[PDB]
């Protein structure tokens, strides 16, 4: 299961089980480029969020109901959607994943 292995490999579920996580299958530079695309408000109202002009390939990882540490279990769902990221710093790069429409 891609989700169980990647979450483990990336030090996400090595010391706990994280409910949900999203992996973007695009190039680093192509994702960083989103910080200068469509500006939109973040869920918290903040306006340093940006939406991708086009959809991107993603894999949504969600914990099943039988998941319990130390044996986390995820459900894998692939799809293509716009990603919304919050940007900060210089260079203006993504620091938070806000959502995917």
């Amino acid at each position: 299961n891609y989700c169980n292995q990647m979450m483990k490999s990336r030090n996400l579920t090595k010391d706990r089980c994280k409910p949900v996580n999203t992996f973007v299958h695009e190039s680093l530079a192509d994702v960083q480029a989103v910080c200068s695309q469509k500006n939109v408000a973040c869920k918290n109202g903040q306006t340093n969020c940006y939406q991708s002009y086009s959809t991107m390939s993603i894999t949504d990882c969600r914990e099943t109901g039988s998941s319990k540490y130390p044996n986390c279990a995820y459900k894998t769902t692939q799809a293509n959607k716009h990603i919304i990221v919050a940007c900060e710093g210089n260079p203006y790069v993504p620091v938070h994943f806000d959502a995917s429409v």
């Binding site: 996400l12 992996f23 973007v24 190039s27 680093l28 994702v31 790069v93 993504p94 620091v95």
Partner: peptide
């Protein structure tokens, strides 16, 4: 240790 920009890539990027 790890920056917010680095954390983001490690947690969500799989190019």
């Amino acid at each position: 240790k790890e920056t917010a920009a680095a954390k983001m890539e490690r947690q969500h990027l799989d190019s």
